[PDB]
Structure formats: structure tokens, C-alpha cells
Design a protein around this ligand. Structure first.
Ligand SMILES: C[As](C)(=O)[O-]
Length: 102
């Protein structure tokens, strides 16, 4: 699982579930891609799947409602699974956290 995916750990509030978890990916223009927002919940690893294509500028914005992550969850990993060309996460915003991946 971890070993074949490209990994981006995160932590969040256990309580606040307003808005979206928004993720910016940069990659080959017109590539197709998928992955998840994974997290631990009561000792299970749960996955919210995402998928999309990069546009002509190489950009892919993924939006996942925060409501999909159960209350009490405080940590996880954004993962890239399939990437037809190149893909990397550059940024995400969840709740009050504006994160840049250097
Ligand atoms: C605010 As930061 C250190 O997660 O880019």
C-alpha cells in the first residue's frame, strides 16, 4: 500500500467538518490520475477515493467534502495511486490549514 503510492501525510482537527478538503496536483498535461485521502479510524485504514485529469496547464484540483472524514479522525495521508504521466501534490487546504508542499 504505502510502498507503491506517493504519500503526503496530514493532520486535522478531530471535530471540525465544515467545508472541503481541497488538494492541488501538478502533472503532465492531460494525464489521468487517481488516489485517495486515507486516514485511520478506530484501527481501520479508510480511504476516500479521488480521480481526475490534469488540464492543459498541468493542473488538477480535487475537492472532497470534509464531511466524508469521520469525527475523531486526526491524521492521514493523501495518496497518489494511478498517474499516467507525472503527478505531484503542491498544496492542500483543509479547515484553517493552508499547506504548501515545498
Ligand atoms: C502552514 As505549512 C508549514 O503546513 O505549509
Amino acid at each position: 500500500e504505502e510502498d507503491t503510492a506517493i504519500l503526503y501525510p496530514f493532520t486535522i482537527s478531530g471535530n471540525d467538518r465544515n467545508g472541503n478538503f481541497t488538494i492541488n496536483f501538478k502533472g503532465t498535461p492531460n494525464s489521468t490520475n487517481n488516489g485517495c485521502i486515507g486516514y485511520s479510524y478506530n484501527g481501520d485504514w479508510e480511504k476516500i477515493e479521488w480521480e481526475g485529469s490534469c488540464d492543459g496547464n498541468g493542473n488538477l484540483v480535487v475537492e472532497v467534502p470534509m464531511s466524508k472524514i469521520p469525527a475523531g479522525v486526526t491524521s492521514g495521508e493523501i495518496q497518489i495511486w494511478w498517474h499516467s504521466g507525472d503527478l505531484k501534490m503542491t498544496d492542500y487546504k483543509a479547515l484553517e490549514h493552508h499547506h504548501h508542499h515545498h
